[PDB]
From a paper:
K48-linked polyUb chains target substrates for proteasomal degradation, but the mechanism of Ub chain synthesis remains elusive due to the transient nature of Ub handover. UBE2K is the only E2 that incorporates a UBA domain, a feature conserved across yeast (Ubc1) and human homologs. We showed that the UBC active site region defines the selectivity for K48-linked Ub chain synthesis, while the UBA domain contributes to processive polyUb formation by orienting UbA at the active site and plays a role in recruitment to Ub-primed substrates.
However, this complex did not yield protein crystals with our RING E3 panel and therefore we cross-linked K48CUb−48Ub to Ub–C92KUBE2KD124C to increase the likelihood for crystallization. In the structure, UbD is primed for transfer by RNF38, while the active site region of UBE2K encloses the distal Ub of K48-Ub2 (hereafter referred to as UbA), which presents as an ‘open’ conformation. To better visualize the actual active site, we modeled the wild-type residues and refined the model including energy minimization. This placed the ε-amino group of K48 of UbA within ~6.4 Å of the UBE2K active site C92, suggesting that the structure approximates the transition-state complex of K48-linked Ub chain synthesis. The active site cross-over loop (residues 85–90) and the N-terminal region of α3-helix (residues 124–129) from the UBC domain form a network of contacts with the short 310-helix region (residues 54–60) of UbA. R54 of UbA forms hydrogen bonds with carbonyl oxygens of P125 and Q126 of UBE2K.
Numbering used by the authors:
A (entry chain E): 1 to 72
B (entry chain B): 1 to 20, 25 to 200
C (entry chain A): 392 to 459
D (entry chain C), E (entry chain D): 1 to 76
């Protein structure tokens, strides 16, 4: 449904997107909102680094989950 | 498609300028994200004569997801938290629909004040009292309406109990909370107030 | 969730439709805009009601199902 | 007898009835002009919601009053 | 007031809370005592999985009640 994405800074960012959305989607989709190159961007959820080939449904990122960004 | 929340809200405001005082929405500041609503207690209910203030927040996906609405004014009702004002109402959750407006939302609240659903409660204590002691619930709601919502009158036997308990040195709102939740039995209200 | 629902570009002179307004965005239907008709006969800007139907299976006016 | 109902397109429609008419009557006439089933129809007038079996005479709906339409709601 | 939080292993946690505390506030206190992200906590009492926005008083949870704490997929 909608899900949250916590910065490196501390600001927690809201995104409404579809489970079909590939991880590559979300790197660039996040970059459009307020972000820098997705190639630098790194996404973590439930202890796992999120591979930019897989998609949100593959990691079962449900409604109102929270993703965390770190940098490579 | 762009987030039409501010535009859709602005459009709702231009629409409400054409009508006939039961409900109103107001801006809280320069931010269309954050509004202030007011409803009147519906007639033939214990809220009658009360004016209830609403904290309305408009998510950026509006109108694709519901506004977040809460009672600022305290109220005694099974489907509203007597503490926080959080409303359990299906059109604010699973049953939102985009054609709805803040107008129809507040009218729906007014309708809810007159149509408690105690078997699926937001506030179990109010719901229990609503089912077990309908008379006591009606008086408790009217007292909350009087104390907190400007309603005309409330029952003297209940406000005498509030006065005796506050004279002991307890804050009225704490007294009122204690008596209402203990079904106006002074003995157990006093024990709750004394406890730490 | 991809529907063959009827879609037609709005024409203010060939207006055989009851509704003049899209209740999702609350703007009028305007010429050359793609509208979408749900099985309950309610019409909207396709861009609007398609967004709603991505996340909901229901008509945003009357709540009728939009799939069966 | 002509009364108004503000509907779920935000707009007001004009209804030809009489005070003798049940709310079920008024609700059925509203599904004519607007496509919302009586089931989903809920009529509120001046903060009071209207039950089907009563009449605009019962509720004292006269002249060109406005009823307000909302989708059915349920406290939970 | 005191409530108790029991896990499936058997450990009981004691918290100081107020009836006014939201469930989210309560999960926060469990974190301060056990390190568990609120994300991962599910609190059960009297047939209900508790919702973050409701308070203990909203669920009529009184002093010396015992809540069940069930955890989530931490692995993913
Ligand atoms: C409305 C009434 C009701 O009981 N429910 C869901 C069942 N339920 C419990 O019994 C305790 C918590 C809960 O969700 C409704 O939706
Ligand atoms: Zn539209
Ligand atoms: Zn419809």
């Amino acid at each position: 449904m909608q899900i949250f994405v916590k910065t490196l800074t501390g600001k927690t960012i809201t995104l409404e997107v579809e489970p079909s959305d590939t991880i590559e989607n979300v790197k660039a989709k996040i970059q459009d909102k307020e972000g820098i190159p997705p190639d630098q961007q790194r996404l973590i959820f439930a202890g796992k680094q999120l591979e930019d080939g897989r998609t949100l449904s593959d990691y079962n990122i449900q409604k109102e989950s929270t993703l965390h960004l770190v940098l490579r | 498609m762009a987030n039409i929340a501010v535009q859709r809200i602005k459009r709702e405001f231009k629409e409400v300028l054409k009508s006939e005082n039961q409900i109103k929405v107001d801006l809280v500041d320069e931010n269309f994200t954050e509004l202030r609503g007011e409803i009147a207690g519906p007639p033939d209910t214990p809220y009658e004569g009360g004016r209830y203030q609403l904290e309305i927040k408009i998510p950026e996906t509006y109108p694709f997801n519901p506004p977040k609405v809460r009672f600022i004014t305290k109220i005694w009702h099974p489907n509203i938290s007597s503490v926080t004002g959080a409303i359990k109402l299906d059109i604010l959750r699973d049953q939102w629909a985009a054609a709805m407006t803040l107008r129809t939302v507040l009218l729906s609240l007014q309708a809810l004040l007159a149509a408690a659903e105690p078997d699926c409660p937001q506030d179990a204590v109010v719901a229990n009292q609503y089912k077990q002691n309908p008379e006591m619930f009606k008086q408790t709601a009217r007292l909350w309406a009087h104390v907190y919502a400007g309603a005309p009158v409330s029952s003297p036997e209940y406000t005498k109990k509030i006065e005796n308990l506050s004279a002991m040195g307890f804050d009225r709102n704490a007294v009122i909370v204690a008596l209402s939740s203990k079904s106006w039995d002074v003995e157990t209200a006093t024990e709750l107030l004394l406890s730490n | 969730d991809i529907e063959q629902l009827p879609s037609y570009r709005f024409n203010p002179n060939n207006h055989q439709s009851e509704q003049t307004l899209c209740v999702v965005c609350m703007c009028d239907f305007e010429s050359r805009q793609l509208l979408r008709v749900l099985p309950c006969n309610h019409e909207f800007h396709a861009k609007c009601v398609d967004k709603w139907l991505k996340a909901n299976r229901t008509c945003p006016i009357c709540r009728a199902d939009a799939s069966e």
